[PDB]
Amino acid sequence: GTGETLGEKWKARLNQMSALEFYSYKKSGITEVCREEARRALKDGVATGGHAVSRGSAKLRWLVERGYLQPYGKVIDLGCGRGGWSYYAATIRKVQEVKGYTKGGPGHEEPVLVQSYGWNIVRLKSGVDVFHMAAEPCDTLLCDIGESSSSPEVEEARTLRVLSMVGDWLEKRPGAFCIKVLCPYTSTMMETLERLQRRYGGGLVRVPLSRNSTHEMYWVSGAKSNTIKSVSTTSQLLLGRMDGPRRPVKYEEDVNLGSGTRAV
Ligand SMILES: Nc1ncnc2c1ncn2[C@@H]1O[C@H](CSCC[C@H](N)C(=O)O)[C@@H](O)[C@H]1O
């Protein structure tokens, strides 16, 4: 054992921040979409304005527009929340069907019904515990599950749980996948991830729309890389942003998902 990884040092420093320091650090220098227009239109019940239902659509757009994920066919979206990934996937030409599942209930996101482009091929189901769902074949497997915790043992336990569950779906051989890895940086987790890459491929990618307060990376089929290096690079990035003054957010215009239905 070589002791403490950079990500463990990052997490320990994060937990030593005051609420003020934490607040300024959380968005320092990150990329963000402005959600003002969408938030207003969704509150007014507007379903045809092209608005994304969450910040998640922009996160998936960042991966897809770079070719790190190429969705196609039957898309399964585990932990779909409001549906940002499912509605984004529905606009993609090679996608033909989107099934999203999410827990819902008090304190959790419920699916939002809008009519962005391709809404007629989307089915979102709440009240579903995905850890009790029998895996089934699909072409594209998405999972965005992993709730942040100030305890790294809790984040590790939660990440191992997600990875064990998605393994059963990946055994059905989807050709594309995008899996949130909440806590990728412990030595045990990195050995687990490399074993999973040897069986299923892919690599981990840091999305710049992620907040500095989480070390989340996305395991995606379209960006194979050395996970030791990709995780360490992200840890160094996040540690460096803890020094020096708070830096401006890079604001982007949010996703326009259009409107209308798709043929078959
Ligand atoms: N056991 C479980 N079964 C189903 N959903 C779960 C779950 N545990 C957590 N979740 C859900 O997974 C979601 C992850 S956040 C999903 C955001 C989504 N990608 C978007 O773009 O909008 C949360 O809404 C959470 O409630």
Numbering used by the authors: 3 to 266
The authors write:
ZIKV nonstructural protein 5(NS5) is a multi-domain protein, which has an N-terminal methyltransferase domain (MTase) and a C-terminal RNA dependent RNA polymerase (RDRP) domain. The MTase can sequentially methylate guanine N-7 and ribose 2′-O to form m7NGpppA2′Om cap structure in the new RNA transcripts. The methylation starts with transferring the methyl group from the donor S-adenosylmethionine (SAM) to the methyl acceptor and then leaves the S-adenosylhomocysteine (SAH) as a byproduct. Defects in MTase are lethal for flaviviruses, which makes MTase a potential target for rational drug design against flaviviruses.
Here, we present the 1.76 Å crystal structure of ZIKV MTase in complex with the byproduct SAH, providing insight into the elegant methylation process, which will benefit the following antiviral drug development. The MTase forms a well-defined 3D structure consisting of nine α-helixes (cyan, α1-α9), nine β-strands (magenta, β1-β9), and multiple loop regions. Together, the α4-α8, β2-β8, and interspersed loops form the Rossman fold, which is a protein structural motif that binds nucleotides. In this structure, the byproduct SAH binds in the pocket of the N-terminal portion of the Rossman fold, which is primarily surrounded by α4-α6, β2, β3, β5, and adjacent loop regions. In the complex structure, SAH is stabilized by hydrogen bond network formed between the ligand and the adjacent residues. Among them, H110, E111, V130, and D131 form the hydrogen bonds with the adenosyl group of SAH; S56, W87, and D146 form the hydrogen bonds with the homocysteine group of SAH. Furthermore, the side chains of F133, V132, and I147 can stack together with the base of SAH to enhance hydrophobic interactions. However, we found that the size of the substrate/byproduct-binding pocket decreases dramatically upon converting SAM to SAH. The binding pocket was closed mainly through two gatekeeper residues: E149 and H110. Taken together, both the SAM/SAH binding pocket and the 7-MeGpp binding channel decreased in size upon converting SAM to SAH during catalysis.
